[PDB]
Amino acid sequence: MSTLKEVQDNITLHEQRLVTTRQKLKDAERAVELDPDDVNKSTLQSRRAAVSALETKLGELKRELADLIAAQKL
Numbered sequence: 001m002s003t004l005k006e007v008q009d010n011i012t013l014h015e016q017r018l019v020t021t022r023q024k025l026k027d028a029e030r031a032v033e034l035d036p037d038d039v040n041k042s043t044l045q046s047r048r049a050a051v052s053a054l055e056t057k058l059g060e061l062k063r064e065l066a067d068l069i070a071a072q073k074l
Helices: 002-036 038-073
Strands: none
Touching: 002 038
């Protein structure tokens, strides 16, 4: 079993990235909270953007492994 192992590793990879990018989001939030300047606010935007996207792609990968499992089964 190549195939299934590698979709899993890629879910692993993205969850690790999500761990870190959520943290950076908390950092951008704290910073905007304390000083709402325009640079702070665009950093906050970008981090929100990266977390939403990783989360979107993780859903995709998980969906795709479930189908790959179901296809092997059938």
